[PDB]
Design a protein around this ligand. Sequence first.
Ligand SMILES: [Cl-]
Ligand SMILES: [Cl-]
Ligand SMILES: [Cl-]
Length: 128
Amino acid sequence: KVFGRCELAAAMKRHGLDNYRGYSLGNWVCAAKFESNFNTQATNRNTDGSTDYGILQINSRWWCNDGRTPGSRNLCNIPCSALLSSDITASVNCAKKIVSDGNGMNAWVAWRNRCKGTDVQAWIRGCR
Ligand SMILES: [Cl-]
Ligand SMILES: [Cl-]
Ligand SMILES: [Cl-]
């Protein structure tokens, strides 16, 4: 599913991301825009052999099991395919574990490089 901007904003707010660990809703929507272009089906391979999955591009090295990342952990205890569902619950639940692990949203390279320090509330401007 390719979400609309305001459609994703509303889904992320319903699942508890608005000001989760201090990060307003626009931070998460900006993050999803540049990680996946709002596409729950997005995948991208990493040079180390891991793969990033879903609207927030969660890495199989640490967070999900895809059966092909040697020496990996599965800290969200889920298959990486669950992060590809048109239902974003698994992705959001796992994102909360990531953003709580010490580095905040700096865990997402795209957030640090394209959202951090910008006017992220523009990503939610004009939505209900
Ligand atoms: Cl599994
Ligand atoms: Cl933080
Ligand atoms: Cl914008």
